[PDB]
Design a protein around this ligand. Structure first.
Ligand SMILES: O=S(=O)(O)c1cc2c(O)c(c1)Cc1cc(S(=O)(=O)O)cc(c1O)Cc1cc(S(=O)(=O)O)cc(c1O)Cc1cc(S(=O)(=O)O)cc(c1O)C2
Ligand SMILES: O=S(=O)(O)c1cc2c(O)c(c1)Cc1cc(S(=O)(=O)O)cc(c1O)Cc1cc(S(=O)(=O)O)cc(c1O)Cc1cc(S(=O)(=O)O)cc(c1O)C2
Ligand SMILES: OC[C@@]1(O)OC[C@@H](O)[C@@H](O)[C@@H]1O
Ligand SMILES: OC[C@@]1(O)OC[C@@H](O)[C@@H](O)[C@@H]1O
Ligand SMILES: OC[C@@]1(O)OC[C@@H](O)[C@@H](O)[C@@H]1O
Ligand SMILES: OC[C@@]1(O)OC[C@@H](O)[C@@H](O)[C@@H]1O
Ligand SMILES: OC[C@@]1(O)OC[C@@H](O)[C@@H](O)[C@@H]1O
Ligand SMILES: OC[C@@]1(O)OC[C@@H](O)[C@@H](O)[C@@H]1O
Lengths: 92, 92, 91
């Protein structure tokens, strides 16, 4: 037997904002916290595995989510215009 | 399930402090580095999968560990005085 | 089939990003510093991977936790190649 779900998390600021990504049944979904209750975020993309990182540029948050199915990893980018596909490629 | 290690890691400051969480045999445990050697930490909760994030408020560390068993993810919170279950829920 | 597993870290405001992929028992690394993705020097065995990093001034320090079976090896970047770290556990 093995685990059936897999998560990744990032956070920023002192409130804080938290984003938790869960890969389950080939789909990644997003839960969000910014100090007043958990809610479902806009991120919804295919994937059996997820990782995430984020950084601030001044006050603006930038998020990168790496979603993998099979040997294909797709990078998704939050830069202030919704989620967009990133340039990331890998030869797996 | 059969013995098998999966980890998550976070760090803070410049020393740094590092915390590494290991899921194995249905339990998540914690190893700690504060600049002078590895030692075992207080975190010990059920789980087959783990992710983590942390943030500083001044010099106080806050840690959130997302422990998953089956399709249920439980958030565990360190805010300076023991690990407590957080409000996180998801619908997996 | 078999799905790869990744871990990611980033630093600064450009930013720099490092993405580690565990694929068929080996962990490799892809890198971004603002001018395209390229393959990094990290190459170690592992079924599972996590990562963290911190800045000391402008200098990045990266720790990659690579696990096979019940054994986790820490790999350390401190400016001059990857070295095995002191991390141990009794899994
Ligand atoms: O040393 S190895 O990791 O190569 C190994 C492989 C297999 C093995 O059967 C064993 C070791 C022996 C063994 C060890 C353990 S442990 O003490 O937990 O390490 C447990 C078992 C076992 O046979 C029993 C066992 C439990 C389960 S579960 O509880 O349902 O998860 C599944 C299995 C078990 O054998 C099936 C199994 C899985 C796996 S896999 O590593 O998950 O692919 C390898 C082997 C297996 O027989 C095939
Ligand atoms: O395009 S699909 O991904 O849908 C596809 C599905 C199946 C397929 O048979 C193929 C493609 C053809 C095919 C492609 C490739 S590839 O060029 O590398 O992408 C490889 C294979 C293949 O049949 C060979 C193959 C490899 C493996 S593995 O080495 O263990 O990963 C498993 C299988 C293979 O056929 C079995 C298999 C699994 C599955 S699963 O449902 O995804 O588990 C679907 C199909 C399969 O043939 C059924
Ligand atoms: O405030 C919620 C939100 O906009 O935060 C940034 C990203 O996590 C988005 O997916 C998410 O919907
Ligand atoms: O989203 C914009 C972008 O340039 O940000 C830095 C890296 O994440 C790149 O892969 C990505 O295309
Ligand atoms: O000093 C060690 C410790 O208190 O650090 C904060 C948390 O990681 C705790 O679980 C851990 O025991
Ligand atoms: O103080 C604990 C808590 O409020 O911290 C912020 C979030 O992690 C919440 O889910 C959690 O319950
Ligand atoms: O500039 C690329 C590089 O040196 O960056 C630091 C580490 O990620 C190394 O593995 C990598 O080769
Ligand atoms: O300089 C390497 C080292 O001391 O860095 C801090 C920790 O990652 C240790 O396990 C590691 O050996």
């Amino acid at each position: 037997m093995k685990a059936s779900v897999q998560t990744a998390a990032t956070s920023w600021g002192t409130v804080p904002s938290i984003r938790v990504y869960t890969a389950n049944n080939g789909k990644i979904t997003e839960r969000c916290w910014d100090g007043k209750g958990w809610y479902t975020g806009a991120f919804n993309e295919p994937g059996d595995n997820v990782s995430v990182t984020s950084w601030l540029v001044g006050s603006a948050i930038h998020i990168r989510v790496y979603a993998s199915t099979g040997t294909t990893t797709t990078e998704w980018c939050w830069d202030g215009n919704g989620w967009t596909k990133g340039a990331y490629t890998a030869t797996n």
